[PDB]
């Protein structure tokens, strides 16, 4: 099993994990749980730790699905990622209705602290802030930016560090897949600046929702992301329209080529649950791209 497990093989190449996004609905259906046990070393909650799932009315938290995933991971010896803690999407209306800076600051801090404390010491990495950038590299004008101001990112990270200093704290975004695209250099410059200002950004997580042929660009984009000087970078929500072995192998090689890249997470198991962009088909059989990653990693 290990000889065809992308997680075991990537660990044998010196990386920390090959991970997957999942949740109770996947783990109790089809072959998802068996595939994840065999092939993936880290699980991320597809939805169960987002703000809409965990705090749908202020101070009224729901951890049913998040608890399920965390205990499933512990029983199966998997690393655990969490998030997203601060995100403009999947955000309850009670949050976006707040217009007072002190109120939203307190709410955001409590949301971060409550989630992170509940699982303190069990979570390898948290996505603390996601999708904070516009495509031109300016900051996205979300309720957090508008109400708290640019300090919301420093505040979120400082609050997260205090709640669980064991975890690696990530900023994440999409369309960081080309070293030419304005967004990639912009997040690098801003993260460099924030870290110089003492903000505890441990990682940049690149979603990596690719279209066909875009894998080649990740070979250049990921080193550029690593030049921000964060402790870690990662590939966080990988899928590839057309699922070409060439695109998938290029993403894997990009991580292999970057010393600070700790691992890769694919955004689900089987295609119907994702452009047929995943590594397993609707019969839960591995696709050519899965076999190609295995062959690339073997030595």
Numbering used by the authors: 1 to 274, 279 to 303
Please share text taken word for word from the publication where this structure appeared.
Cryogenic structures of HG3 and HG3.7 in the absence of a ligand revealed that β-strands 6 and 7 (located adjacent to the binding pocket), adopt two distinct backbone conformations whereas only a single conformer is observed for HG3.17. One conformation matches that seen in the corresponding complexes with a transition-state analog (TSA), and presumably represents the active sub-state. In the inactive sub-state, however, a backbone flip creates a steric clash between the carbonyl group of Leu236 and the nitro group of the TSA that would block ligand binding. Estimating the respective populations from the volumes of duplicated cross peaks shows that the inactive species comprises ~25% of the HG3 and HG3.7 samples at 25 °C, but only 5% of HG3.17. Although conformational selection has been observed in the optimization of other designed enzymes, including Kemp eliminases, what is striking in the HG3 system is that the active conformational sub-state was not explicitly engineered into the xylanase scaffold but only emerged upon introduction of the 11 design mutations due to a serendipitous backbone flip. Instead, design created two “energetically frustrated” enzyme conformations.
